[PDB]
Write an enzyme that holds these catalytic residues in place. Structure first.
Site, short mmCIF file in Angstrom:
data_model
loop_
_atom_site.label_atom_id
_atom_site.label_comp_id
_atom_site.label_asym_id
_atom_site.label_seq_id
_atom_site.Cartn_x
_atom_site.Cartn_y
_atom_site.Cartn_z
N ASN A 1 -2.83 1.96 13.15
CA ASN A 1 -3.09 3.30 12.64
C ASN A 1 -4.21 3.21 11.62
O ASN A 1 -4.01 2.67 10.51
CB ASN A 1 -1.82 3.87 12.02
N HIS B 1 1.56 3.79 2.14
CA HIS B 1 2.17 4.42 3.31
C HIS B 1 3.67 4.25 3.33
O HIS B 1 4.24 3.37 2.66
CB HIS B 1 1.51 3.89 4.58
N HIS C 1 0.88 -1.18 0.00
CA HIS C 1 0.00 0.00 0.00
C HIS C 1 0.90 1.22 0.00
O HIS C 1 2.13 1.12 -0.04
CB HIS C 1 -1.05 0.00 1.12
N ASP D 1 5.73 3.08 5.44
CA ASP D 1 6.26 1.77 5.88
C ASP D 1 6.28 0.76 4.72
O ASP D 1 6.79 -0.34 4.91
CB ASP D 1 5.58 1.27 7.13
N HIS E 1 -7.13 -1.81 6.06
CA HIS E 1 -6.24 -0.81 6.61
C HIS E 1 -6.13 0.40 5.71
O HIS E 1 -6.02 1.55 6.18
CB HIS E 1 -4.86 -1.45 6.84
C1 LIG Z 1 3.33 4.93 8.28
C2 LIG Z 1 2.09 4.36 8.95
C3 LIG Z 1 2.21 4.17 10.42
C4 LIG Z 1 2.87 5.03 11.30
C5 LIG Z 1 2.93 4.76 12.68
C6 LIG Z 1 2.37 3.66 13.25
C7 LIG Z 1 1.65 2.76 12.39
C8 LIG Z 1 0.94 1.56 12.64
C9 LIG Z 1 0.72 0.92 13.88
C10 LIG Z 1 0.36 1.65 15.02
N1 LIG Z 1 0.11 1.06 16.18
C11 LIG Z 1 0.34 -0.22 16.43
O1 LIG Z 1 0.13 -0.67 17.59
C12 LIG Z 1 0.69 -0.99 15.31
F1 LIG Z 1 0.91 -2.34 15.47
C13 LIG Z 1 0.88 -0.48 14.05
C14 LIG Z 1 0.50 1.19 11.36
C15 LIG Z 1 -0.37 0.02 10.99
O2 LIG Z 1 -1.28 -0.24 11.78
O3 LIG Z 1 -0.28 -0.47 9.81
N2 LIG Z 1 0.93 2.03 10.43
C16 LIG Z 1 1.61 3.05 11.04
N3 LIG Z 1 0.95 5.28 8.65
C17 LIG Z 1 0.94 6.75 8.84
C18 LIG Z 1 -0.43 7.10 8.47
C19 LIG Z 1 -0.57 7.82 7.17
C20 LIG Z 1 -1.49 8.85 7.85
C21 LIG Z 1 -1.15 10.30 7.77
N4 LIG Z 1 -1.88 10.89 6.69
C22 LIG Z 1 -1.16 8.24 9.18
O4 LIG Z 1 -1.18 5.87 8.58
C23 LIG Z 1 -0.33 4.79 8.66
O5 LIG Z 1 -0.70 3.66 8.69
ZN LIG Z 2 -0.42 1.77 6.43
ZN LIG Z 3 1.43 -0.48 8.53
#
Ligand SMILES: C[C@@H](c1cccc2c(-c3c[nH]c(=O)c(F)c3)c(C(=O)O)[nH]c12)N1C[C@]2(C[C@@H](CN)C2)OC1=O
Ligand SMILES: [Zn+2]
Ligand SMILES: [Zn+2]
Length: 232
Positions: free
Chosen positions: A181, A87, A85, A89, A150
């Protein structure tokens, strides 16, 4: 020392690999976001005498470190990458990959979202994935679009030789008490998307989440449970 790594066992700026099955590894890295540190996973799949990478290591420097770790531990060239996807990560590090000669791929939906958001953009579009339940072959894997979860563009990856299901961020680890998130999520569709995954890959033996520990098929039901309860 053989356990699945975590933020506590990855030295700063480092990447670790974990053997999942014959010719299948996960990659684990850590990154800071909004003042907290998180692990994240990707996949590496042997493609003859080459490697297919699934997802970056969440940043340019982490992804350079990933390539170095792969050279150390495996020694075969990464020739293609798929981002599951849009993002950071999943795509942060695509510029590093492309400058290293890796051909980078994502769905057109992922590419559009990455561009709009200001994230790094894979070069090549993966057609044939625009409707939920669609699947296409890509080297040693099958790519599957389960529907919005997600994110609206999230893909899953199956390795048929090993019955390994890489759920990416549409799938959460068993210890997860929260749906992670959810900024770009569709909580209402997510359980229906997970059901599509469950139906399409009933013989999966390992399920790998986008963040946290692999397990079995129960990750899928657990994910559905946590997403429904979050929405409740
Ligand atoms: C890069 C990614 C991201 C950042 C920080 C934490 C997570 C988590 C996560 C959290 N907490 C957990 O306990 C867990 F296990 C996973 C996940 C996920 O859950 O995949 N992804 C993260 N971004 C950022 C953002 C794009 C949006 C701004 N416009 C906000 O959204 C997004 O996913
Ligand atoms: Zn994501
Ligand atoms: Zn993620």
């Amino acid at each position: 020392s053989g356990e699945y790594p975590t933020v506590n066992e990855i030295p700063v700026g480092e990447v670790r690999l974990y053997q999942i099955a014959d010719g299948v590894w996960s990659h684990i890295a850590t990154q800071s976001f909004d003042g907290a540190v998180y692990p994240s996973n990707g996949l590496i799949v042997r493609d003859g005498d080459e490697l297919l990478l699934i997802d970056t290591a969440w940043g340019a420097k982490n992804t350079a470190a990933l390539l170095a770790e792969i050279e150390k531990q495996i020694g075969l060239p990464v020739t293609r990458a798929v981002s599951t996807h849009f993002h950071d990560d999943r795509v942060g590090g695509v510029d590093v990959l492309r400058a290293a000669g890796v051909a980078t791929y994502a769905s057109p939906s992922t590419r559009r979202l990455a561009e709009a958001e200001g994230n790094e953009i894979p070069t090549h579009s993966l057609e044939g994935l625009s409707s939920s339940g669609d699947a296409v072959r890509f080297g040693p894997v099958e790519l599957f679009y389960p529907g919005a979860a997600h994110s609206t563009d999230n893909l899953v990856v199956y390795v048929p030789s090993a019955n390994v299901l890489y759920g990416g961020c549409a799938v959460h680890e068993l210890s997860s008490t929260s749906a992670g998130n959810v900024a770009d999520a569709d909580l209402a569709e997510w359980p229906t998307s997970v059901e599509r995954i469950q139906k399409h890959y009933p013989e999966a033996e390992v399920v790998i989440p986008g963040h946290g520990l692999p397990g079995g098929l129960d990750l899928l039901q657990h994910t559905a449970n946590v997403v429904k309860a979050h929405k409740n």
